[PDB]
Design a protein around this ligand. Structure first.
Ligand SMILES: [O]C(=O)C1=N[C]=[C]C2=[C@]13S[C@@]23[S]
Ligand SMILES: O=C(O)c1ncccc1S
Ligand SMILES: [Mn+2]
Ligand SMILES: [Mn+2]
Ligand code: NA
Length: 616
């Protein structure tokens, strides 16, 4: 873009650019970069090109400043350890700004909304002014041009993230498509404006802990959908700082999707091929605490079946002119929870993460390897462990929210269409939650409307003493870009869309325990048997029986060959007393939390379920 006019010498930042050119940027890109540079006062501006050279040098530099360590056991893998105050998304400091609160969250009947956090426009200007002026003093402002989705896909959308964190740059290179080709594709078009800062201008006013710059007290993750802006301050943690992911691809994206006729959801996408050489794509939404990544990369136990991964976290879906629900994975990598990852739980992840992968808050072995709880692999004596707190270890060795951040292209079961610009046709949508009692292994919704209800009704046992069953509709509770009632209405409207081929909707539960606490289902790759049943159902097979909660596998329909005796009686048991309570808790929840914005059809599904249960 062109040089700003000025009476002095404070507005044109061209002389501080150390890679790239303000002149070569599209006009609105320069205005976004230069205006924030005027505000944040970085020492330098680096316009990222996405090259391997850039990446390699940025890593080595972080290595030089003690901010990351090379993991010598592996091929180009790296470890970051954070300030223990900056380890996770902070929901209570995550907000969406709109003129009217009701556009962002429903106004609850009696309680506080659990479905979002609204902040007023005026409150946010004050909060911004108290954080961003001068915040990058002494630092480089990196400019990251990025695409969500395959470059050029009709479903893809472009952002520009400004950040003062090299860690965010490196991770965005993995988790998005980043660099010069994006700028060239963008041209004079529109882009989501993403501004991030760790909130630690130099000279530092407060102690730097573990060489991890952050500002926990002023952490604030804000979304301004009307301005097409995401503005995030004080956290380097991925869900807070990698703005393409939750901020853009769920919060901003879900609101855009509502307005444009598509869906942005917290779903994995997998492709499954059966022994008859037929392949289907499925999407699944489980709470953050559950195992999307494991299901998306499942190694099936059933012979002749194959599972391939399109994505493990976020799906962008649009019914096309032909009525097919086409989906893309808008991301470029996997930002997976490391603990619990083993050759038994996810052998394909184990394979993926030994090259070109950045790990955060895991333990390090003395031979330059990684360790965490649940890795389920012994260490040779001699090999010692440094914890994620940078101390010798024999409390966990890795933070429970520690991560790997790995390229999608490296997954040995990555689907051949995982980057196809047209997306993949979704034929089933799976909801699920961790339920120790009452809820069967699998059931199928009676209708589209019943299925949307099933999404809305999702509950799951929270990670621990005492247990709590929390609501998490569509697995979107932390992620709604707008009023949940209106999101319900948007999903319900798909039934009325000309030509739409509405996928079958299922609900799963791998967690049911019997009368004495015994797991009723062995899980892992045996979950391929559930996927088999769903596959058949989608093909029209007569393999279901009706129950009050929906369809379940009829007698002998579920493939149990090789498993022995399975207590299907208890696993598929439906208790009237459990379901009476369940429907009441769902009622109370929807009435309070959705209130005047609850669609008629969802109230009707509630009444119908109540009625079916009453007739048991
Ligand atoms: O089990 C368990 O855990 C399960 N199932 C189904 C679905 C989902 C889960 S977790 C989540 S989160
Ligand atoms: O909380 C989430 O669902 C999540 N999913 C993937 C990667 C990071 C996060 S913060
Ligand atoms: Mn997620
Ligand atoms: Mn309708
Ligand atoms: Na560190």
């Amino acid at each position: 873009g062109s040089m700003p006019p000025q009476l002095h010498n404070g507005l044109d930042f061209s002389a501080k650019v150390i890679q790239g050119s303000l002149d070569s940027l599209p006009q609105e890109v320069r205005k976004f970069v230069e205006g924030n540079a005027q505000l944040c006062q970085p020492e330098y501006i680096h316009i990222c090109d996405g090259s391997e050279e850039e990446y390699g040098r940025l890593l080595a530099h972080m290595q030089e400043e003690g901010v990351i360590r090379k993991l010598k056991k592996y091929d180009n893998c790296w470890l970051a350890l954070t300030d223990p105050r900056d380890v996770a998304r902070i929901e209570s400091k995550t907000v969406i700004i709109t003129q009217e609160q009701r556009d962002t969250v429903p106004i609850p009947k009696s309680g506080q909304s659990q479905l979002g956090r609204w902040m007023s426009e005026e409150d946010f200007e004050k909060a911004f002014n108290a954080r961003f002026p001068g915040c990058m003093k002494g630092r480089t402002m990196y400019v990251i041009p990025f695409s969500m989705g395959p470059l050029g896909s009709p479903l893809a959308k472009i952002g520009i993230e400004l950040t003062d964190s090299p860690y965010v740059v490196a991770s965005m290179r993995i988790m998005t498509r980043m660099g010069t080709s994006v700028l060239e594709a963008l041209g004079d078009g529109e882009f989501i404006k993403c501004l991030h800062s760790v909130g630690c201008p130099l000279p530092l006013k407060k102690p730097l802990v573990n060489n991890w710059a952050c500002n926990p007290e002023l952490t604030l993750i804000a979304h301004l959908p009307d301005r097409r802006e995401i503005i995030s301050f004080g956290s380097g943690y991925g869900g807070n700082s990698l703005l393409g992911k939750k901020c853009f691809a769920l919060r901003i994206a879900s609101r855009l999707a509502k307005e444009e006729g598509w869906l942005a959801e917290h779903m994995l996408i997998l492709g499954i091929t059966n022994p008859e050489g037929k392949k289907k794509y499925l999407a699944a939404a489980f709470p953050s605490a559950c195992g999307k990544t494991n299901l998306a990369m499942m190694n099936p136990t059933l012979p002749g079946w194959k599972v391939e991964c399109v994505g493990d976290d976020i799906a962008w879906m649009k019914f096309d002119a032909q009525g097919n629900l086409r989906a893309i994975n808008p991301e470029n990598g996997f930002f997976g929870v490391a603990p619990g990852t083993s050759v038994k739980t996810n052998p394909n992840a184990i394979k993926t993460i030994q090259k070109n992968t950045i790990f955060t808050n895991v333990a390090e072995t003395s031979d330059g390897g990684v360790y965490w709880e649940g890795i389920d692999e012994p260490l040779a004596p001699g090999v010692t462990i440094t914890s994620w707190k940078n101390k010798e270890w024999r409390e966990p060795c890795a933070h429970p929210n520690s991560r790997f951040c790995t390229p999608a292209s490296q997954c040995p079961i990555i689907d051949p269409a995982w980057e196809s610009p047209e997306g993949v046709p979704i034929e089933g949508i799976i909801f699920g939650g961790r339920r120790p009692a009452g809820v069967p292994l699998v059931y199928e919704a009676l209708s589209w409307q019943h299925g949307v209800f099933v999404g809305a009704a999702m509950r799951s046992e929270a990670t621990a003493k005492g247990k709590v069953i929390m609501h998490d509709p569509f697995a979107m509770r932390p992620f709604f870009g707008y009023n949940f009632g209106k999101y319900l209405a948007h999903w319900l409207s798909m039934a009325h869309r000309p030509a739409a081929k509405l996928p079958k909707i299922f609900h799963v539960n791998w967690f049911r325990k019997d009368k004495n606490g015994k797991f009723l289902w062995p899980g892992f790759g045996e979950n391929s048997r559930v996927l088999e049943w769903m596959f058949g159902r989608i093909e029209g097979e007569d393999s279901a029986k009706l129950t009050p909660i929906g369809y379940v596998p009829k007698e002998d329909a579920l493939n149990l060959k090789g498993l022995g005796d399975v207590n299907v009686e208890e696993l598929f048991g439906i208790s009237k007393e459990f379901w009476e309570k369940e429907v009441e808790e769902i009622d109370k929840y929807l009435e309070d939390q959705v209130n005047a914005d609850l669609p008629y059809e969802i109230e009707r599904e509630l009444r119908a379920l109540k009625q079916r249960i009453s007739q048991m």
